[PDB]
């Protein structure tokens, strides 16, 4: 089977630079320790404006993740989470960027759980990921769990069940649930 | 006093890549620009796309690639038009512009297997989901099967995500059912006011054994034509073998949807080697005259039904040709492809449509404009000549009446049509102009189109214009823009514009230059031209036999099918008995029916130029906004015409 | 903007997929067998429907043959959810009722919900585009609450309904999104006169078992009113147990003790729990009757109290039927000023649109300058801006008609208006007095192209949420020093609108 | 025995969409039956039909035996006991129609 | 052997139905079979004749129920071409209804 892995990081100002560094480094480790067959990686940084830091084509041609992740900055915008997702499903999972049909499609949403200024809601874009069939792993950060409505924003983003998908970034055993879900898949 | 210019479509479609072009004429330094899209009214920042800076290294040009996000905002029942405020900030200067927006996400194309079905049959239909660029998109659609009454008798809600733009469907037709024209309506989830339709007939029938073609020699009836109504009857079996039978032909007249039968006209005619000739004799028609009104008859049409019976006895076929116009004029002239506005003292290029009375083009017809005794021209196979007339430099409205000069026709017959063309108003009527000239011939992707920039002004200013900035608007979007450098003194420059597959089937091209003219005022002159492109697919699809074993097929014979086409492309098939079509051929899917809707979808309103340089952009469907204060008037209507659609 | 602590409706992923059956699957058993058993594990998705999913299967091997299986049960649910209960055969253009039941299976935690009936242009609801309809409620653990919602099916066919309920100081939200069939009547033959000029210019080349009189009256001495019902049966012999479903005008509750007083009443009974239910969200009441009479009026009445203050109030609803038969029911809606309790809509030959949004664009703001005045006049939406004089007035129950005298066409739009012309502007009856409008007065007015009632030339005008109207006095009525400021901005609005025209 | 139009519709992701020109295909034999049966009929309502033998052989008339088979749901002269046959001679390039 | 997805249906619903063809030895075969769909009246409003070899005795089928249709007890009769007296049946009900939310059991 075909392992298509996408990565969506928040860059909003609410992301303190230390949270942000953890994100970039955790992603790079996620890919690194996901060194395994037939896995493809693409990334976009999301805030109030979006910019895909690498596509799948650019990844099959460049396997070194550290080379892909170093140049990434913070955006310091607003937080258009909902809009970011249609940018993931409509662009990253397009055949034009490398997307293969009948592949295991996973989205890694890495944010603190605070959408703001987004004109789009979730009731259009979440059922979209499900009608397209993308299994959504969410990685909350900093104080993504201090508040109540943030952490539920996460389960709102994460596919069900959220206990199996919602994880903190510093936790090192966020991969093994998925690293393993493929070993006989 | 630096000038900042921004340009975008007259209408902004949601969930689609639109482009915005940025230029900074003659302003020093790397110049940053930030554009943001705001609700109208307020500071909602619907979109603020990426950072861009216009460098002298790049001659102060960059563009903005952006897609408008939706926020579920429109109005049902009565429809009010939605708007957004675009905001451009060149460093400190802010240039703002209120733009219309449309919900329409893309296109949807309904294929049924065939045109006509019987009670108890399955209607197989596919639906074709494409974006504004005829590329696959995935949205939910709603499919309704609506009888002649209009009542949905089957409805569904389905998504096209990862179905490659094809939604194979079906619906089973009931034994007890209303006969007539049934519909298939579909529409994207996002944009329901935009309905896509196809009709199909439901009648109790059995396929025949032979087809009958009743076809008159010439497409109309000249009112004084001595020969009368001459018709060639072709009757043949479906495999290509000629039929033996008898024919029964009655005549009738058709007025809009009001039809008047001619019972004395019915004549029985033998069948001669699977072909025939038949005449409505001048002698036949006149006996028992009815509501003759010779002068009045022009403008109506005639229908003729033949009921053909085999010589063996098994199958009878009723065939009919309807819509036969009784003319004084073999033709009709229309100005539908003609610009309404001209550059005074410059050539005026007409695409007059010579039309045969049913709608078909006219082949090898000499035509000319009354007056200008100098020259006459000849119609192509399309019934169109590029009558290029010389304007006299003068601000009188130019009035043109086109007549045909087709030999072997009466001079009264010759078809005529009149229009009036109005001068491009110059700023204070300073009569500094721009003329775009480009040769109008069916342009194929891969051909090079030379673009001619004609500059008209005193020597005081001509050295100032040092490049021209050009723009190609296609299918409702800005496709390419750039600059062609100019050196002081060349009044005319040509851009060898190489034509690509994006340009299909046609496009308009606008362009402009800027300077600081009379009364210290920054001045911009622009001009626009519609260019048609060879109609075809972006890619290509060919079906031929895959067995170099030529032979004619046999019931139950095996066959190998060869499909040649673009790599990775998905191909859906269907094989229909040609015999079906003898009973119905309407709403059959064609590459043509694609393009005809598409061109309807265009936002441009005039084939050419406009009343003034503002009308250029508006008539083309474009917004220009500059830091100086010059910008396009506002567009509040979705449709163009003087009589609305 | 009172409280910031709820999940936005805009982010409430509803329940979407409710197939009555699915997974028609066909899968093949390729697995290396152990014990003589190939084992297959098909990871799938769980539909947005809360029910136990029964799974039935059949193994067709060509060697051993067919084999039915032991059905498999997958028990699906959430702690807190909704299910929505609708009819099937509803009729377009007829006001109806739905009921939404939120269940709470949390064992010890009560809940406070803000739930919105979601706006739909296919339905005449209370929910305009911009004016939400959010009801706030509380739930006892291990209990569910019935919420009524009366609507008008404005269109035909497969219409979906949505309701999104969000909670406070807790986690989940939910949303129901459920379709059904809407259909037409076709009569349009109500007491027609022989030639009523109903025809257009360009065409052409029901309670049969039950008597039910319900009237809600007011009280003598927050606010309390009387509910009155008056019922009978039409047949040869008296009928069996009849039932009443009664639902509360938004934020209403009956008088707990008069409720008790009535239940001891003859031929009547309401169990204790729906009778000692709490005043917190006591909202829907069911009363069962021993029998009902075919011989005369047996009425009933009792008190209702106002628990929460909102200006606009859903009609109450009362549905009565014989114990055995629901489908031959009779439903009435009540409202004290709305006769027969029906929402205001606007109707022509077979079309209607919902007239229930704010009467006109909100007045009395601190800002009345030219700056905002022009901005709402320079918007593209403004099709027409006229200045007329209130000439005639048709007042009626349905709507109240103001006959306006256009002398000048300030800015025509998609309208073909001649000079010295008389045109019909409408205002709903609920709005009439709020407008403080008098004849003989000039008015400078504006609206949109969408706000035109009819087709040409037998047209009318409608004052909507965003229509702007303002009276214009005479020359002898603006010379006052007090009235300067008004007539000042009138003169400068006009001239700068006139000279400059519209900007674009 | 006829001529089919086969239509191919294709869409790639980048090469847009293309309905190709039709492809005709001609089912035609030397000898065959055209069998002229109504859409429906009424039960117990007797009519005839026609099975038209097409002798599209070149230069030889054709002595054929024409025949029907036994459906106990119809009353014709054919049985398993006794059949219902003519014996007919067809000139080349012609259409002989047998009544049943 | 006939499997319908549901036992009761709404007008305008899609009826999904499978047929299992086996001999008296209960083995999947591919053979020719006639399918007759009878309305409450009993009247076969659809028929079809297919063979299942290499479909493994499995005939997956589909029928669109008309919006205007007589409600009531519908049947599915089907038989081998060769043995018409040997007819096998299944019913299914057509009525306008809504799925309930709880069940009621009387004992
Ligand atoms: C907006 O900017 C885009 C990139 O900044 C630009 O895209 C470029 O579009 C041109 C179209 O002319 C393409 O140019 C050439 O591509 C190949 C290159 O070998 C040639 O064979 C062609 O003939 C063609 O001239 C670029 O490939 C394309 N590049 C990218 C990265 O998109 C848009 O054209 C710009 N549009 C506007 C309106 O400014
Ligand atoms: C019939 O007339 C009454 C008023 O007399 C009105 O309330 C009702 O809406 C009308 N019904 C129809 C179907 O027009
Ligand atoms: K045939
Ligand atoms: K249920
Ligand atoms: Mg932030």
């Amino acid at each position: 089977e075909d392992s298509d892995i996408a990565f969506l990081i928040d860059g909003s100002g609410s992301i303190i630079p230390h949270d942000f560094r953890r994100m970039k480094e955790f992603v790079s480790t996620v890919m690194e320790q996901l060194k395994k067959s037939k896995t493809l990686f693409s990334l976009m940084q999301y805030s109030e404006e979006f910019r895909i830091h690498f596509t799948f084509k650019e990844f099959q041609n460049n396997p070194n993740p550290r080379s892909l992740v170093k140049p990434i900055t913070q955006l310091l915008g607003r937080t258009h989470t909902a809009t970011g997702i249609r940018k993931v499903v409509r662009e990253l999972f397009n055949i034009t960027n490398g997307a293969r049909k009948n592949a295991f499609k996973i989205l890694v949403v890495i944010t603190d759980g605070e959408k703001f200024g987004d004109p789009l809601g979730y009731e259009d874009v979440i059922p979209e990921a499900d009608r397209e069939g993308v299994i959504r792993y969410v990685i909350g950060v900093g104080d993504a769990f201090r508040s109540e409505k943030s952490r539920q924003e996460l389960n709102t983003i994460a596919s069900k069940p959220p206990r199996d998908h919602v994880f903190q970034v510093n936790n090192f055993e966020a991969l093994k649930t998925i690293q393993n879900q493929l070993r006989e898949k | 006093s630096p000038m900042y210019s921004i340009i975008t479509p007259n209408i902004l479609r949601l969930e689609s890549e639109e482009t915005m072009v940025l230029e900074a004429h003659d302003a020093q330094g790397d110049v940053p620009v930030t554009v943001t899209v705001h609700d109208f009214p307020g500071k909602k920042l619907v979109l603020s796309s990426e950072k861009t800076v216009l460098t002298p290294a790049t001659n102060h040009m960059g563009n903005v690639t952006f897609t408008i996000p939706a926020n579920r905002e429109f109005k049902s029942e009565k429809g009010r038009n939605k708007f957004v405020t675009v905001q451009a900030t060149f460093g400190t200067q802010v240039v703002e512009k209120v733009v219309l927006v449309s919900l329409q996400s893309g296109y949807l194309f309904i294929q049924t297997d065939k045109t006509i079905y019987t009670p108890g049959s399955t209607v197989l239909y596919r639906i074709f989901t494409v974006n504004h660029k005829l590329l696959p998109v995935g949205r939910t659609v709603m499919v309704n099967i609506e009888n002649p009454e209009g009542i949905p008798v089957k409805q569904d809600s389905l998504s096209s995500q990862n179905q490659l733009g094809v939604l194979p469907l079906s619906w089973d037709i009931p034994e007890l059912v209303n006969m007539g024209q049934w519909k298939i309506r579909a529409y994207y989830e996002n944009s329901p006011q935009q309905v896509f339709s196809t009709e199909f007939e439901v009648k109790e029938y059995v396929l025949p054994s032979f087809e009958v073609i009743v076809e008159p020699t010439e497409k109309f009836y000249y009112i004084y034509n001595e020969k009368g109504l001459e018709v060639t009857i072709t009757a043949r079996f479906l495999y290509g073998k000629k039929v033996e039978g008898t024919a029964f032909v009655i005549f009738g007249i058709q007025d809009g949807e009001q039809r008047i039968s001619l019972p004395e006209s019915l004549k029985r005619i033998p069948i001669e080697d699977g072909s025939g000739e038949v005449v409505l004799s001048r002698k036949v028609l006149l006996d028992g005259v009815q509501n003759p009104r010779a002068e009045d008859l022009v403008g109506k049409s005639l229908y003729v039904s033949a009921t053909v019976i085999l010589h063996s006895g098994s199958d009878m076929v009723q065939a009919e040709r309807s819509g036969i116009p009784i003319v004084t004029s073999p033709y009709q002239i229309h100005f539908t492809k003609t610009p309404k506005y001209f550059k005074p003292g410059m050539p005026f290029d007409l695409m007059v449509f010579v039309t045969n009375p049913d709608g078909s083009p006219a082949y090898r017809v000499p035509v000319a404009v009354q007056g200008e005794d100098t020259v006459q021209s000849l119609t192509q196979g399309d019934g169109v000549a590029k009558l290029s007339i010389n304007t006299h430099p003068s601000q009188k409205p130019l009035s043109i009446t086109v007549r045909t000069k087709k030999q072997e026709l009466s001079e009264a017959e010759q078809a005529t049509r009149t229009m009036q063309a109005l001068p491009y108003s110059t700023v204070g009527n300073s009569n500094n102009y721009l003329h775009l000239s480009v040769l109008r011939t069916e342009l194929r992707p891969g051909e090079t189109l030379n673009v001619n920039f004609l500059l008209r002004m005193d020597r005081a200013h001509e050295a100032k214009i040092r490049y021209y900035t050009y723009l190609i608007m296609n299918k409702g979007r800005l496709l390419k823009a750039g600059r062609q450098v100019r050196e002081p003194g060349q009044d005319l420059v040509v851009l060898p514009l190489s034509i690509t597959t994006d340009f299909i089937p046609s496009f308009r091209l606008v362009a402009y230059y800027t300077l600081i003219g009379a009364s210290g005022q920054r001045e911009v002159v622009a001009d626009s031209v519609w260019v048609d492109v060879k109609d075809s697919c972006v890619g290509s699809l060919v079906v031929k036999s895959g067995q170099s074993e030529d032979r004619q097929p046999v019931p139950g014979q095996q066959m190998t099918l060869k499909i040649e086409g673009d790599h990775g492309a998905r191909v859906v098939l269907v094989a229909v008995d040609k015999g079906v079509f003898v009973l119905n051929k309407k709403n059959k899917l064609t590459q043509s029916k694609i393009w005809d809707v598409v061109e309807k979808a265009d936002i441009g309103c005039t084939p050419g130029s406009g009343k003034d340089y503002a009308g250029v952009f508006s008539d083309a469907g474009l917004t220009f906004t500059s830091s100086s204060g010059q910008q396009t008037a506002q567009r509040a209507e979705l449709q163009c015409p003087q009589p609305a659609a | 903007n009172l409280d910031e602590d709820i999940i936005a409706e805009e982010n409430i992923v509803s329940r979407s997929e409710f197939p009555e059956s699915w997974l028609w699957n066909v899968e093949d058993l390729k697995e290396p067998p152990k014990n003589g058993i190939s084992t297959k594990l098909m990871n799938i998705f769980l539909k947005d429907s809360i029910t136990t999913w029964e799974i039935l299967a059949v193994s067709m091997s060509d060697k051993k043959g067919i084999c039915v299986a032991d059905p498999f049960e997958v028990t699906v649910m959430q702690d807190f959810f909704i299910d929505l209960r609708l009819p099937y055969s509803v009729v377009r253009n007829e006001q109806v009722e739905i009921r939404a039941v939120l269940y709470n299976y949390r064992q010890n935690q009560e809940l406070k919900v803000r739930v919105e009936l979601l706006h739909n242009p296919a339905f005449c609801s209370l929910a305009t585009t911009k004016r939400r309809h959010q009801q706030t409620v509380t739930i006892p653990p291990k209990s569910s609450l019935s919420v009524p919602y009366v609507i008008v099916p404005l269109k035909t066919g497969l219409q979906e309904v949505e309701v999104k309920a969000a909670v406070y100081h807790h986690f989940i939200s939910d949303g129901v999104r459920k379709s059904l069939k809407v259909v037409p009547e076709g009569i349009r033959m109500n007491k027609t006169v022989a030639v009523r000029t109903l025809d257009p210019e360009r065409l052409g080349r029901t309670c049969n078992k039950f008597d039910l009189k319900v009237t809600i009256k007011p009280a003598p001495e927050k606010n309390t009113m009387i509910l009155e019902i008056c019922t009978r049966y039409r047949g040869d012999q008296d009928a069996t147990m009849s039932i009443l479903d009664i639902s509360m005008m938004t934020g209403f509750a009956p008088d707990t003790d008069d409720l008790k007083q009535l239940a001891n009443g003859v031929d009547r009974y309401i169990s204790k729990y729906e009778l000692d239910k709490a005043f917190s969200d006591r909202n829907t009441l069911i009363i069962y009757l021993d029998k009902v009479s075919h011989s005369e009026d047996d009425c009933l009445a009792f008190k209702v109290h106002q628990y929460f203050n909102v200006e606009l109030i859903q009609p109450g609803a009362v549905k009565v039927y014989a114990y055995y038969n629901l489908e031959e029911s009779c439903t009435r809606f009540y409202h004290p000023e709305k006769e027969d309790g029906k929402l205001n809509k606007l109707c022509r030959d077979e079309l209607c649109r919902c007239a229930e949004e704010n009467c006109f664009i909100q007045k009395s703001d601190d800002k009345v300058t030219l700056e905002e005045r022009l901005d709402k006049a320079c918007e593209p939406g403004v099709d027409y801006v006229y200045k007329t004089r209130l000439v005639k007035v048709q007042l009626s129950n349905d709507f109240d008609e103001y006959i306006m005298a256009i002398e000048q066409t300030i800015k025509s739009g998609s309208d073909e208006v001649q000079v010295g012309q008389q045109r019909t502007f409408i205002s709903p009856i609920k709005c009439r007095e709020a407008l403080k409008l008098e004849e003989k007065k000039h008015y400078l007015m504006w609206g949109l192209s969408s706000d035109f009632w009819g087709e040409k030339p037998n047209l009318s005008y409608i004052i909507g949420k965003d229509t702007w109207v303002e009276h214009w006095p005479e020359e002898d009525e603006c010379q006052d020093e007090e009235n300067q400021k008004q007539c000042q901005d009138l003169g400068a609005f006009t001239e700068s609108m006139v000279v400059f025209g519209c900007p674009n």
Side-chain angles (χ1 to χ4, degrees), chain C residues 49-51 83 85:
Chain C
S49 194
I50 303 189
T51 279
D83 220 41
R85 314 250 75 93

Side-chain angles (χ1 to χ4, degrees), chain A residues 1-181:
Chain A
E1 310 269 353
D2 281 342
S3 309
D4 302 353
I5 297 93
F7 291 87
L8 179 60
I9 68 177
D10 197 328
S12 64
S14 69
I15 300 309
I16 78 177
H18 185 216
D19 292 9
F20 199 107
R21 291 227 74 256
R22 280 212 306 198
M23 295 200 282
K24 134 172 60 183
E25 304 301 326
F26 184 77
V27 175
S28 313
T29 318
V30 177
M31 298 184 189
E32 282 185 23
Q33 208 60 276
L34 201 33
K35 184 282 161 53
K36 225 202 171 273
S37 36
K38 294 352 291 173
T39 69
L40 282 144
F41 297 105
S42 176
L43 195 144
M44 179 178 73
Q45 212 212 319
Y46 95 81
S47 44
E48 81 189 334
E49 101 186 61
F50 323 80
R51 185 171 302 105
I52 306 97
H53 295 285
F54 63 96
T55 87
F56 293 106
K57 271 187 176 180
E58 288 196 317
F59 170 68
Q60 205 165 12
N61 310 302
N62 196 300
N64 306 325
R66 172 223 83 89
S67 67
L68 300 165
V69 200
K70 177 56 182 168
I72 290 179
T73 82
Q74 198 169 344
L75 269 66
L76 297 177
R78 295 183 163 199
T79 325
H80 291 167
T81 312
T83 297
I85 297 178
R86 247 156 168 184
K87 284 198 146 65
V88 163
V89 303
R90 293 261 192 76
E91 312 195 354
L92 282 193
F93 278 112
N94 197 314
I95 307 87
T96 287
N97 282 308
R100 317 170 282 190
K101 180 220 226 303
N102 293 329
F104 283 90
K105 303 172 182 187
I106 293 91
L107 166 58
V108 185
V109 179
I110 315 188
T111 185
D112 52 332
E114 179 198 8
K115 190 187 75 169
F116 186 49
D118 199 337
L120 266 186
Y122 286 87
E123 56 277 34
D124 294 336
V125 306
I126 297 307
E128 193 168 348
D130 306 314
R131 68 196 49 174
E132 196 144 353
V134 175
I135 310 179
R136 279 174 273 97
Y137 296 110
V138 169
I139 311 298
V141 302
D143 290 30
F145 304 81
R146 192 293 323 247
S147 277
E148 216 157 343
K149 284 184 39 55
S150 69
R151 62 185 94 189
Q152 256 293 80
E153 180 162 324
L154 301 181
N155 310 321
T156 301
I157 300 179
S159 55
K160 307 297 179 181
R163 65 174 174 261
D164 287 9
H165 297 46
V166 187
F167 306 142
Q168 194 170 25
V169 47
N170 44 274
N171 313 356
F172 289 77
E173 305 195 31
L175 174 60
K176 189 265 279 297
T177 280
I178 198 44
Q179 189 171 5
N180 171 271
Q181 213 74 190

Side-chain angles (χ1 to χ4, degrees), chain B residues 291-523:
Chain B
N291 199 92
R293 324 304 340 284
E295 322 182 359
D296 283 9
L297 284 180
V298 175
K300 303 173 187 180
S301 76
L302 275 86
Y303 70 87
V304 170
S305 157
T307 298
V308 179
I309 298 180
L310 275 185
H311 283 149
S312 295
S314 80
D315 206 5
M316 60 178 273
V317 179
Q318 304 190 71
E320 163 171 326
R321 266 302 288 263
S322 297
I324 304 178
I326 294 181
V327 304
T328 80
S329 193
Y331 302 151
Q332 299 166 344
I333 309 186
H334 298 251
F335 285 120
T336 53
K337 266 188 191 173
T338 56
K340 177 72 173 51
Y341 302 96
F342 71 96
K343 298 147 269 210
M346 300 294 199
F348 181 66
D349 311 324
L350 288 93
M351 311 314 169
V352 169
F353 192 35
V354 185
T355 85
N356 308 17
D358 68 343
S360 47
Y363 188 37
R364 291 168 182 174
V365 174
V367 284
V369 304
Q370 175 185 8
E372 181 125 329
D373 286 39
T374 316
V375 185
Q376 307 166 46
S377 147
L378 177 58
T379 75
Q380 275 198 10
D382 55 23
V384 178
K386 185 227 170 177
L387 292 181
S388 81
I389 80 186
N390 294 92
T391 47
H392 290 175
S394 45
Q395 291 229 349
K396 68 190 192 74
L398 187 43
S399 182
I400 306 301
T401 285
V402 155
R403 294 187 67 96
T404 71
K405 288 200 161 177
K406 200 248 167 190
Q407 311 201 5
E408 301 221 43
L409 261 43
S410 93
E411 279 301 351
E413 283 148 20
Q414 300 300 352
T416 174
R417 194 69 107 85
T418 304
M419 75 165 198
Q420 171 197 212
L422 308 172
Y424 168 97
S425 147
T426 326
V427 177
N429 308 283
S430 88
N431 297 30
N432 295 8
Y433 293 95
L434 174 66
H435 179 70
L436 286 159
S437 68
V438 153
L439 252 72
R440 181 66 283 289
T441 304
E442 280 290 273
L443 258 172
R444 292 182 158 178
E447 298 175 320
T448 300
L449 181 55
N450 290 288
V451 190
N452 313 254
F453 301 114
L454 183 49
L455 177 62
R456 201 76 187 92
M457 64 169 24
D458 58 357
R459 54 185 94 111
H461 305 314
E462 61 77 42
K464 288 160 177 181
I465 300 95
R466 301 283 301 265
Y467 57 80
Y468 306 84
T469 291
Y470 65 95
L471 311 80
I472 309 176
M473 160 58 74
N474 167 262
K475 293 189 287 275
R477 84 201 160 296
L478 288 195
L479 197 40
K480 183 61 169 309
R483 103 189 182 285
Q484 176 53 81
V485 292
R486 182 211 181 274
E487 178 288 327
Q490 296 189 71
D491 291 356
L492 186 83
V493 198
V494 169
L495 173 61
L497 172 58
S498 173
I499 311 307
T500 67
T501 54
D502 305 337
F503 291 90
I504 306 183
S506 57
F507 70 87
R508 286 182 169 68
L509 197 158
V510 310
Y512 81 105
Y513 65 91
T514 183
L515 85 163
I516 319 96
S519 204
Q521 77 199 343
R522 181 55 116 166
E523 185 185 271

Side-chain angles (χ1 to χ4, degrees), chain B residues 207-210 237-239 315 577:
Chain B
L207 276 203
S209 35
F210 65 92
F237 290 92
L238 281 283
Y239 33 104
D315 206 5
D577 182 347

